[PDB]
Design a protein around this ligand. Structure first.
Ligand code: HEM
Ligand code: HEM
Ligand code: HEM
Ligand code: HEM
Ligand SMILES: COC(=O)c1ccc(COc2ccc(OC)cc2C)cn1
Ligand SMILES: COC(=O)c1ccc(COc2ccc(OC)cc2C)cn1
Lengths: 146, 141, 141, 146
């Protein structure tokens, strides 16, 4: 629950410019394409047979929006990530049994998507601050494993 | 293990890096050192200040090595043998650190090459850098 | 990437399994199912009760595939192509489960072949199983 | 961690037979041999240049005995692992910056060594109980990362 004041400011400043309707869908989609075993968790979502099918799948985009909503909730509560994600941790760990490494993968995919969208504006300091966020979200989600 | 499509994607995307080799290499290094400061301890005698000539020079070395890997994507253990000697036997780099640099290389490519960084190319670049990392971290001599 | 010594170590050690292929294979699976219950979700249609029969038969298939991998240690992507299709494209097994089974295989070999299980041979078997794992989880077709 | 009383009895019976002079050194030694990068944390231990050198190294044997001793204290305090390892966690995380994955690696190497020593006595149910212990210990060591 660190993040320096400067890290919080940088993270907060960039997130205000994030398209909450698109980014979550991109990140989830890329998770499914880059790490194809994760598709096993989403068998009811329909066609995941090609990258184009995944990235254009309505259910993937819809679910991504919920996922990004939870990241937004994390970012508005940076000093209490553990409590923010407590219920999601029970779901992902106790019920879904998603291996925690996958939490880290999704986090870093999100970071690639932020880079992809913002380009040079996603500077090394901004990236470093965001790496703290997604590490914090990942550990918080894996809390029920601890 | 790379698919034919992976090899096609990696060659096409890295080909587009071209003369920006040293620049993207140095940027990925600086992103790593800043995001993951423990990685700095592998370079105890380096000048790792921002904009450092030494880091510029090293990024070019890292980028050129990847270009070599791409050119020998079907013969990488042979091609990277000396690099494996260094990272695996001498330095004994923790494979987690290769995951960190690989991610920062992807972040840099995404920040500079938005049109090319498609989900399929992202996926292929990730596997390629994972494969390179495996080769560099294993003692096969 | 396996060294020439890795390959030698693995062949010598695995060649001791012999007629115990089914026994050791089944034992490795049993250890996995018991130690890491989440791995059972990949076999919902299986009788996973203690001893069973389906498990013992499946253990033989697993051990025989390893034997085949050993014999084709320099050509594993080709030799294991069918299994890669199964585990990677059809089953979509999370790579973490391959680490679990690999560890259980090591445990089984240590318990049955103490003279074979030296530190060096342990390191080689670990890299070998890691490599087989990578092949079985990669979509390289 | 939750062992059954039956599991607890099996773990304790096995542990009481463990060669405290060698088992810890063999676990630490194999860690250094099988995952050579871990040697970077032990530069002052002298010769680690070959497997024979590693296993036979007096400092490796001596340090492994301390590692085994920590597992022994874990076994004797299964209801309070986070408190028991609190000191060690601050050492390994805050000071040494050991990557959490390495904790898991050593725990499983210990298991291989127990298998190596005890043979058929190290049954699958005995292993399953020990896997609960080493997971518990490893998590307790990483918990100042959380
Ligand atoms: C690491 C950051 C992650 C965050 C913040 C996150 C967030 C969420 C949220 C908000 C939901 C909606 C739950 C509900 O409304 O009941 C959800 C569901 C779900 N998540 Fe995640 N998630 C993450 C990672 C993952 C990963 C890595 C996987 C698997 C590889 C995964 C698999 C699932 C599945 C299968 C569901 C239920 C989907 C359904 O309704 O069928 N999650 N997650
Ligand atoms: C894609 C992955 C990597 C590539 C392609 C790569 C490539 C290279 C190259 C070409 C060199 C210079 C060799 C020479 O001197 O001729 C080098 C040196 C070095 N690399 Fe890497 N490397 C990679 C990953 C890493 C990582 C992850 C680390 C540590 C976190 C690392 C640590 C070092 C160190 C400590 C040196 C020597 C610097 C010195 O002169 O003291 N490398 N690498
Ligand atoms: C690590 C090395 C592994 C090897 C060498 C291996 C080998 C095999 C073989 C030979 C088969 C039988 C294929 C056939 O003849 O139809 C098989 C099937 C299967 N394996 Fe694996 N396997 C490995 C790992 C795993 C892991 C880690 C999992 C999951 C945790 C897994 C889950 C399955 C499943 C669900 C089947 C299909 C069973 C059936 O319905 O017949 N395997 N594997
Ligand atoms: C996972 C279970 C582990 C346990 C139970 C354990 C246990 C211990 C114990 C009891 C000490 C002595 C501390 C003291 O005397 O104050 C110690 C020190 C140390 N540990 Fe660990 N350890 C574990 C994992 C690791 C790993 C994976 C590494 C590195 C790869 C590591 C690196 C070290 C180092 C460098 C020291 C100090 C050695 C010195 O004084 O030079 N530990 N550990
Ligand atoms: C001649 O080429 C080889 O023999 C050879 C052998 C091994 C490797 C490493 O392969 C890996 C390693 C990791 C990995 O993670 C996704 C993927 C691959 C293909 C690459 N090449
Ligand atoms: C030799 O034929 C190949 O192309 C080929 C390609 C990749 C691989 C997988 O290689 C790995 C994977 C993981 C790993 O962890 C230690 C080591 C190796 C050599 C094995 N073979």
């Amino acid at each position: 629950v660190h993040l320096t004041p400067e890290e919080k400011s940088a993270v907060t400043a960039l997130w205000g410019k994030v398209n909450v309707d698109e980014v979550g869908g991109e990140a989830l989609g890329r998770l499914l394409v880059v790490y194809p075993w994760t598709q096993r968790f989403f068998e009811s979502f329909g066609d995941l047979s090609t990258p184009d099918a995944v990235m254009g799948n309505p259910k993937v985009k819809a679910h991504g929006k919920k996922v990004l909503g939870a990241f937004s909730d994390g970012l508005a509560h940076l000093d209490n990530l553990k409590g923010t994600f407590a219920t999601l941790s029970e779901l992902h760990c106790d019920k879904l049994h998603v291996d925690p490494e996958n939490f880290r993968l999704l986090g870093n995919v999100l970071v690639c998507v932020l880079a992809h969208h913002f380009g040079k504006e996603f500077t090394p300091p901004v990236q470093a601050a965001y790496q703290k966020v997604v590490a914090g979200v990942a550990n918080a989600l894996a809390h029920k494993y601890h | 293990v790379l698919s034919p499509a992976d090899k096609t994607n990696v060659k096409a995307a890295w080909g587009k890096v071209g003369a920006h080799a040293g620049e993207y290499g140095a940027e990925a290094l600086e992103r790593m050192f800043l995001s993951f400061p423990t990685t700095k301890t592998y370079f105890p005698h380096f000048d790792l200040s921002h904009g450092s000539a030494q880091v510029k020079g090293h990024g070019k070395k890292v980028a050129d090595a990847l270009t070599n890997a791409v050119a020998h994507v079907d013969d990488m253990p042979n091609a990277l043998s000396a690099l494996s000697d260094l990272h695996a036997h001498k330095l004994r780099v923790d494979p987690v650190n290769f995951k960190l640099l690989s991610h920062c290389l992807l972040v840099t490519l995404a920040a500079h090459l938005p049109a090319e960084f498609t989900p399929a190319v992202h996926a292929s670049l990730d596997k390629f850098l994972a494969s390179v990392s495996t080769v560099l971290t294993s003692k096969y001599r």
